[PDB]
Amino acid sequence: HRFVQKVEEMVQNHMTYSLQDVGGDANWQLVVEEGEMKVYRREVEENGIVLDPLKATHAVKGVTGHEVCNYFWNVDVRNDWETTIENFHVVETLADNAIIIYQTHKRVWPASQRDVLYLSVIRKIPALTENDPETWIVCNFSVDHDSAPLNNRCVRAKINVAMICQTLVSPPQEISRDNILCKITYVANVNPGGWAPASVLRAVAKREYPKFLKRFTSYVQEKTAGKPILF
Numbered sequence: 001h002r003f004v005q006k007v008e009e010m011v012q013n014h015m016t017y018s019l020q021d022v023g024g025d026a027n028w029q030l031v032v033e034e035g036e037m038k039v040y041r042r043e044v045e046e047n048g049i050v051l052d053p054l055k056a057t058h059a060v061k062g063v064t065g066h067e068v069c070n071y072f073w074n075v076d077v078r079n080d081w082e083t084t085i086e087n088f089h090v091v092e093t094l095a096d097n098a099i100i101i102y103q104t105h106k107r108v109w110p111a112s113q114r115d116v117l118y119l120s121v122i123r124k125i126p127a128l129t130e131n132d133p134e135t136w137i138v139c140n141f142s143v144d145h146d147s148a149p150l151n152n153r154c155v156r157a158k159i160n161v162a163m164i165c166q167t168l169v170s171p172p173q174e175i176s177r178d179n180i181l182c183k184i185t186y187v188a189n190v191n192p193g194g195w196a197p198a199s200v201l202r203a204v205a206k207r208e209y210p211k212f213l214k215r216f217t218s219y220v221q222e223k224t225a226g227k228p229i230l231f
């Protein structure tokens, strides 16, 4: 499909940069910590527009990276966990693992409602060596599409989001979900697409990202509990 090169560039950039430890960078601040979930943000505002890169890490017992990515990507289960949208639909299927999605978000007062149009791709990155972890990644990044032009009711946000998963399995005869731990890195780089009050945007991000990470990961645990493991 026409976006294959763009997908590869986006995936490679995440694998090169998004897994780099930000812990030693004074510009990256821990904003939320609960259990194994840590949420960090770098405050960035250019021409009044809040761009604050967000990075979270989590460690989720009893689920695999393949499972987590499947649930994050699969549009059929989207409304079971997502809480920030008014509607979404699939604009185009590019491949078995790549779709283009249009969605409108819930309005955050006092700003205009935001919409987004993004390619969502799920990819397995095989281990190259014995000690290299296998990675499952979902990348959601803005693309243009003639069937979803700009409209007069919403401001079009631009996003680059990834959910990046590596799975640790402890030696057991068969593997139990008690033996598996999914290490998650989630990154979100969002351009709100126009002015919005900085304090409001930052408060909403601080609330909504951990709320999502907790809700979504608990959902995957709930939906996979008692079921055969999909590695």
Ligand SMILES: CCCCCCCCCCCCC/C=C/[C@@H](O)[C@H](CO)NC(=O)CCCCCCCCCCCCCCC
Binding pocket: 082, 083, 084, 105, 106, 107, 108, 111, 112, 114, 116, 140, 157, 159, 161, 190, 192, 196, 200, 201, 202, 204, 205, 208, 209, 212
């Ligand atoms: C009632 C709350 C309404 C919030 C509306 C925020 C609109 C901001 C622009 C779009 C944000 C992109 C969210 C990414 C979505 C997809 O990758 C995916 C599937 O939907 N979900 C997540 O990654 C899970 C993402 C969950 C967290 C999203 C919260 C973002 C808040 C940002 C700060 C407020 C921005 C409002 C602009 C005026």
